[PDB]
């Protein structure tokens, strides 16, 4: 019925490589420039799912006198337990016990190999970070949790 949950990120806390919502799409930022006519920052990113390039400029708000803030939207990452691994997909489990049988892992920064070495040395401590896009979920990062 909607996209997902988003968080507001100030523009001075956005660097190359960050994941931003560019025109409703989760994108990895690959170029940051500044509009000369407006002063907004314009962000060029790669869609994590379609590998397509999207552009979006920042939003300027004026919430109080002498307070001008430029923001973008970021995705809210979910943490899923990894129960098993087998060809590209993993078997994940949410915090409430909901089981995902065929969760795909993004081919980015050789994440599947880092996820496989951590899984075979501590199964209960491996998490994946998941981005939801209009029902499509994908693991984009990992995180080892010591308890």
Three-point CA angle 78, 139, 48, nearest 5°: 110
Q: CB-wise, 96 or 110, nearer to its own copies?
A: 96
Asked if residue 78 binds its own copies (CB under 8 A), the reply is: yes
Question: Residue 75: CB partners within 8 Å, gap ≥ 6?
Answer: 4, 5, 6, 7, 19, 20, 21, 26, 131, 132
Tokens of 21: 């919502």
Contact stretch for its own copies (CB under 8 A) within 8-16, 25-33, 44-52, 109-117? 8-16
Residue 62 to residue 69: CA distance in whole angstroms: 7
Minimum CB separation of residue 129 from its own copies in Å reads 9
Q: Which of residues 79-108 bind its own copies (CB under 8 A)?
A: 79-80, 94-96
Asked if residue 121 binds its own copies (CB under 8 A), the reply is: no
Residue 145 to residue 147: CA distance in whole angstroms: 6
Asked if residue 137 binds its own copies (CB under 8 A), the reply is: no
Q: Would you tell me which residues interact with its own copies (CB under 8 A)? A: 5, 7, 9-10, 13-15, 18, 36-37, 39, 64-69, 74, 76-80, 94-96, 145-146
């Amino acid at each position: 019925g909607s996209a997902s949950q988003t968080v507001t990120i100030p523009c001075h806390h956005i660097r190359l490589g960050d994941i931003l919502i560019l025109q409703g799409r989760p994108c990895q930022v690959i170029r940051i420039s500044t509009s000369a006519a407006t002063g907004q920052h314009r962000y060029l990113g790669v869609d994590l799912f379609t590998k397509q390039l999207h552009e979006e400029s920042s939003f300027v708000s004026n919430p109080a006198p002498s307070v001008v803030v430029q923001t973008m939207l970021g995705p809210v990452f979910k943490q899923y337990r990894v129960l098993d691994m087998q060809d590209g997909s993993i078997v994940a489990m949410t915090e409430t016990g909901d089981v995902k049988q065929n969760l795909p892992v993004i081919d980015q920064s050789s994440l599947w190999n880092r996820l496989q070495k951590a899984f075979e040395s501590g199964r209960g401590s491996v998490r994946v970070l998941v981005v939801s896009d209009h029902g499509r979920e994908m693991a984009v990062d990992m995180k080892v949790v010591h308890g």
